[PDB]
Design a protein around this nucleic acid. Structure first.
Length: 50
RNA sequence: ACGAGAACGCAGCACCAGCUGUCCAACCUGAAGAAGA
């Protein structure tokens, strides 16, 4: 990494935003208090990482 | 009633002329918002 040059991410789309619920997996799908807006699927982002 | 008396070592004259406090040098190195809210 100290000889690698990782860069930032490029543009992430604005029309691909979709709020989602966080759920539990332990033998039941009980919702959890914290929610968050997220990014909807089938979105493509690009980089320039060499 | 003195080898004496009288007699400015004084007058004119720029410590001055030319000369980059410059040249080289990355404020740089190493470091996830996860996690049982």
């Amino acid at each position: 990494f100290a000889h690698l040059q990782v860069s930032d991410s490029e543009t992430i789309d604005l029309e691909n935003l979709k709020v989602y619920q966080k759920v539990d997996y332990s033998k039941t799908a009980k919702p959890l208090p914290l929610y968050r807006e997220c990014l909807k699927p089938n979105t493509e982002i690009t980089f320039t990482v060499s």
